[PDB]
Each structure stands twice: as C-alpha cells, then as structure tokens.
Design a protein around this ligand. Structure first.
Ligand SMILES: Cc1nc(=O)c2cc(CN(C)c3ccc(C(=O)N[C@@H](CCC(=O)O)C(=O)O)s3)ccc2[nH]1
Ligand SMILES: Cc1nc(=O)c2cc(CN(C)c3ccc(C(=O)N[C@@H](CCC(=O)O)C(=O)O)s3)ccc2[nH]1
Ligand SMILES: O=c1ccn([C@H]2C[C@H](O)[C@@H](COP(=O)(O)O)O2)c(=O)[nH]1
Ligand SMILES: O=c1ccn([C@H]2C[C@H](O)[C@@H](COP(=O)(O)O)O2)c(=O)[nH]1
Lengths: 261, 261
C-alpha cells in the first residue's frame, strides 16, 4: 500500500501546469485523496528518509499553542524560520487556533480539549472538529493554514481522522503532514482510550513544484519497504507528551532526498 | 456516471451500524468522496424527483446573508421551519458566515465577495476558501453547519469546487447539497467569466438513517436517466440572481420518494 507514491505519480503524470504565488511553477490536480490504515503501520515514508524529529517537535509546538518559533528553534527545528518576524512571531497560526481560537465574547476556545472531551463522552458525535481556518485572523498569519480543518470519527472502538489540506506541496510538506496527523491520531486515541483506525487525507490544490521533478522521479524509482511502528509512553494529558515519549521502531528508509535551493 | 447512487449502495452494503444524536440509528462510513463533471450535466438526481425549487431558494437565501427563515417561508420553502425560533431565527448559520463573518476587529467579512474577487484577479490562488465553520459562533447556531467548508480551483479557464461536508444524511440532505453546490459553482463561474469543471463532494460521517433503508432500496432499484442542463440568465452580480434566472432543462426523474415519518 503506497497511497502517497500513487498520488505523487498520478500528479506527475496528469497534473496541469499552473503558475503560483511563489512564481516557481507547478503541476497540479484538485480534490485528491489518500487513505492509510494506521493499524497496519505508521505512514512515515520509506522511499525517502523523512526527518521525523522535526515532524514530532512541530506537532508538540502546535499542541503548546505557540505563535513564536523560539521553542522550535531551541530543539533544533528550523522549518518555520524563514516566515518568522525578527522577534520570532508567526501570527495566530495553527497552534494558536487549535488551543485558543478567540470568540467574539472574549473567550478563547481550546478545540483540542473539546475534541478529546467529545471522543470520551460522545464518540458517535458528527461534530468532532478542529479548524485552523479562522477567516477573521488569516491576514495576520505569516501563511494561511495549509492543513486547515480536521474531523475525528469513531467506529467500534477505533479512531479515524480526516484532514482537509487546501494546499499541498507534495514533495516537501505532504510527507511531514501525513506523519504529523498520524502521530496526532495516535496521541488522541491514547488519551481517549481508543485504538487507531484510518487516516484520510483530502487535498485541495495538490502540486509538484517544477524544481522538484528530478527529486520526485528518483523517489518513484524506489521500492517501498515495511512501515515502522509507533509507540508512545504513558501520560496524563495530550499536553504532557514530550519528544522522548515517542519511539519509531523499525524505520528503514531509502536515503534522504535533499530539497532544491 | 452515478457517484451518488454508488456511494448510497456502498454505505448500505458495507457501512457500520452506529448510534446518533437524533436517536434514530444509522449505518455509516467516514471520509467518502463523489466527483461530478459539471460540463457533462447538472447533478440533479434522476433516480427520484428532487425539489429543486427548495434547493434554489435555499441557496439564494444563503447568498442574501439571512439568518431568518422569513424570506424562505414567503417563497413556499419549509425545510428550515422546524429549526427556527418563535421569531423564525436560526442564529448565525451558513449565510451569515458567508456574507458577514465577524472578525475580532469589529469588521464583518463577506467571504463570497472575497472568493469571487480571487477568482477574477488571482484565479491561481490556493486560498480561495469559504468557511461556515466559525468555532466561536457554533453554539449560537440552531444546527452546526453540515456543508462546512468549500474551496475553488481554476485550470484552463475551468472552475472546480470541492465541498467538505462534515455530516451527511445521504438520503435526505445530500441530494440537496449536491445540487446546491453545483448551482453555486455555475454562478461563480459566470461571474468570473469561467466555464464549469468538477464538483468534488468530500464527506465526513456519511450515513443512511435506519428509517430510510426501504426508501433507499427503491431508489437503488431504478435505472438513471440523462442529467438535465442548467441554464442561468445573465446578471452583473451573484447577489442579483433570482429564482426566475434559474432554469433546469430536460429534467426527467422517477417519482418522488417521501421522507418517512
Ligand atoms: C512551497 C512550500 N512547501 C512547503 O512544504 C512549506 C512548509 C512550511 C513549514 N513546514 C510545514 C515544513 C515541513 C517540511 C519542511 C522542509 O524543510 N523539509 C525538509 C526537512 C529538513 C530538516 O528539517 O531536516 C525535507 O523534508 O527535505 S518545511 C512553510 C512554507 C512552505 N512553502
Ligand atoms: C437527521 C437530519 N437529515 C437532514 O437531511 C436534515 C436537513 C436540514 C435542512 N435542509 C438542508 C434540508 C434539505 C432537504 C430536506 C427535506 O425535507 N427534503 C424533502 C422535500 C422537502 C422540501 O422540498 O421542502 C425531500 O427531499 O424528499 S431538509 C435540517 C436538519 C436535518 N437533520
Ligand atoms: O504544513 C504545510 C505548510 C505549507 N505547505 C505548502 C503548500 C503550498 O505550496 C505552500 C503554501 O503556499 P500557498 O498555498 O498559501 O500559496 O506551502 C504544505 O504543503 N504543508
Ligand atoms: O445541508 C444539510 C443540513 C443537515 N444534514 C444532516 C446531517 C445529519 O444527519 C444532520 C445534522 O445532525 P448532526 O450531524 O449535527 O448530529 O442533518 C445534511 O445531510 N445536509
């Protein structure tokens, strides 16, 4: 099962050429979908070595509800550095919205706690939603959210998660996004007393940048290997997980493929 | 091409039995997709008669930005009456968020105009989004938004739209939802000087209500007929469309199937 490589190949082969905000140029398709059965393995890609350390810390960073790169920086993760101000600020991005979405009333809404609370007390709910798409605050963000909106689902004790990603840099960002949300689903499941089901990735603008074509063709020439296995130490709260509470067992990827400068 | 009936059949056959809010009981799948090529035909189902008039007035009502069933009632449409207050108020639902999302600055954001603007001046944008999922105002709503979040995409002068529908009553709601978004996509296309492309329907919790099983089987037993054609009169503004402007040519459906008591 290689949902990601399948999609990458599909877009490489049938994507429409298309200009963009960065001026780099892309090939693109709209409304494409991936499904991983998380009970079958953790979807950290094996066709190139993915820097999980940065994935994990970025997610922990989101869960803290930080808007400033400082903490990410202290753990050696520089993926957000370009976009920060000189004081480190990114604006009310992902984590700020996840943890403290400002309602007109002056209350800040912790969507992550709310979601977990629903998984525990009313798992059949069709409203277990977290949205980072705060129409009123987009303009103050350094970048509008790419992974914008996500929903949980429970069936026979198993937790599934679907993410709507409006904009999908397939080579660079997407491998991070998949691992991030699979990790999140594990954490949420652990905290809710559920086992993991499916992760469904639904994308809007799914693109390959014109300057990643060689890197992509190389990746598609590689034979996929067994997915690794995710383990988590026990914690009282999702907000108490640390990097050290996470282990990825039997991760055996093909070599890393550097992003073009 | 029958994405709706296929999905309907698929949930009936392989969906998991599942309790719900209304107490009715459902059979359910998570994360299912339908695609329609809008250039091939207007996806008003033919396997049963769909009250398009209700569909069109509802959409015009959203576009007006109304929170009160009034304008709808006056036009012989009753689908929201049951959820309204004594004053006929639904709180800040679809239309209010579409036309006037409250930002923390006090400003009110007309998402419909902002999307149209992007379609006209920056059609390559990957940020052409409209969201009804306003976390801070959900509690004030009669019902949380089902069709929650949608995005536009342009390629080769062709406009596509993807809808994220967090919750979908497959028998009753979804046939309206499909028509409604296909209709809006035509309006946006005309207003931006684009032709129509794909409507992609992405669902969260997709369910058949226990009390709809017999009606579902009837619908599945019928052979589909050609889709009708949408004919939209010229207007210089999306907000100036009227019901009279909206014509459905050659709609030849099987008989209506009433929603059981
Ligand atoms: C065009 C574009 N594509 C992106 O994926 C993107 C991602 C972020 C933040 N983010 C979500 C990122 C996820 C992965 C990144 C990247 O640098 N990947 C290297 C990792 C190098 C390292 O940290 O060891 C790699 O995977 O090759 S950056 C900000 C602007 C963007 N702009
Ligand atoms: C459990 C549930 N299922 C729904 O489909 C639903 C729909 C609305 C509002 N709305 C989005 C509706 C779309 C279609 C409707 C329905 O009654 N249709 C009948 C004809 C009624 C009419 O034409 O006025 C039909 O389709 O057979 S109602 C509010 C709460 C709900 N609650
Ligand atoms: O977590 C992320 C953050 C950014 N991007 C990519 C998608 C786009 O190529 C670009 C964002 O730019 P716009 O879509 O807003 O133009 O970065 C991702 O794929 N995942
Ligand atoms: O345009 C709409 C409005 C409502 N619903 C259905 C979905 C659910 O069955 C119900 C809403 O109930 P909850 O998902 O919030 O429990 O109404 C739709 O299918 N389409």
């Amino acid at each position: 099962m290689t949902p990601y490589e399948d999609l990458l190949r599909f877009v490489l082969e049938t994507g429409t050429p298309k200009s963009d905000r960065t001026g780099t140029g892309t090939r693109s398709l709209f409304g494409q979908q991936m499904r991983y059965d998380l009970s079958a393995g953790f979807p950290l890609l094996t066709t190139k070595k993915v820097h999980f350390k940065s994935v994990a810390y970025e997610l922990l960073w989101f869960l803290r509800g930080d808007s400033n790169i400082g903490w990410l920086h202290e753990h050696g993760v520089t993926i957000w550095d370009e976009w920060a101000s000189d004081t480190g600020e990114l604006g009310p991005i992902y984590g700020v919205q996840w943890r403290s979405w400002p309602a007109p009333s002056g209350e800040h809404i912790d969507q992550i706690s709310a979601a977990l609370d629903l998984l525990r007390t009313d798992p059949d709910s069709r409203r277990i939603i977290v949205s980072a798409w705060n129409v009123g605050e987009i303009e103050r963000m350094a970048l509008p959210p790419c992974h914008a909106f996500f929903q949980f689902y429970v069936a026979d004790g198993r937790l599934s998660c679907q993410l709507y990603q409006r904009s999908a840099d397939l080579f660079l960002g997407v491998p991070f996004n998949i691992a991030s949300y699979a990790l999140l689903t594990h954490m949420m499941a652990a905290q809710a007393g559920l086992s993991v089901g499916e992760f469904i990735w639904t994308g809007g603008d799914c693109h390959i940048y014109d300057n990643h074509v060689e890197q992509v063709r190389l990746q598609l020439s590689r034979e996929p290997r067994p997915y690794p296995k995710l383990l988590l130490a026990d914690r009282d709260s999702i907000f108490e997980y640390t990097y050290e509470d996470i282990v990825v067992k039997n991760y055996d990827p093909h070599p890393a493929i550097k992003a073009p400068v």
